[PDB]
């Protein structure tokens, strides 16, 4: 099982602001840099957020990240159809001494 907890699936319509969550513990999320990535089926992930809240140049400005204690979050401010994908969080874990991951949150853009 993934050591970090993400809700498996979220829906929304274009334009809606949706935030997804990544819950960990004192020995991971709380403690350590959190990274988020976006994965479409069959292709290489795109890093959306590194070091908790930093957005690479080239990632659309509607994506932002932050960390509140044992919980990290990724906000998508104005969902687009092209945002339908699987979103993962990860960080180092002090107690397992290696990388830990959420199980991914699949975002569906409806209408």
Interface residues with a copy of itself (CB under 8 A) are 31-33, 42, 44-45, 92, 94, 97, 99
Nearest distance in Å: CB 67, a copy of itself: 14
Nearest distance in Å: CB 24, a copy of itself: 14
Q: Which helix (H) or strand (E) holds 46?
A: strand 46-49
d(CA 1, CA 45): 20
- The SS3 of residue 43 is coil
**Environment class of residue 37 by beta-carbon count within 10 Å: exposed (0-12), middle (13-18) or buried (19+)?**
buried
Binding mask 44-83 for ligand DIW (x = CB under 6 A): ---x--x-----xx--------------------------
Q: By CB under 6 A, name the binding residues for ligand DIW.
A: 35, 37, 47, 50, 56-57, 90, 99
């Amino acid at each position: 099982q993934p050591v970090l907890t993400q809700s498996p699936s979220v829906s929304g319509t274009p334009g809606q602001k949706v935030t997804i969550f990544c819950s960990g513990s004192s020995s991971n999320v709380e403690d350590n840099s959190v990274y988020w990535y976006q994965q479409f089926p069959g292709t290489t992930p795109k890093v959306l957020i590194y070091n908790d809240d930093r957005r690479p140049s080239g990632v659309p400005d509607r994506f932002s990240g932050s960390k509140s204690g044992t919980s990290a979050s990724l906000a998508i401010s104005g969902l687009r159809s092209e945002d339908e994908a699987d979103y993962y969080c990860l960080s180092w874990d002090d107690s397992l001494n290696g990388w830990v991951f959420g199980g991914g949150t699949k975002v569906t853009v409806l209408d």
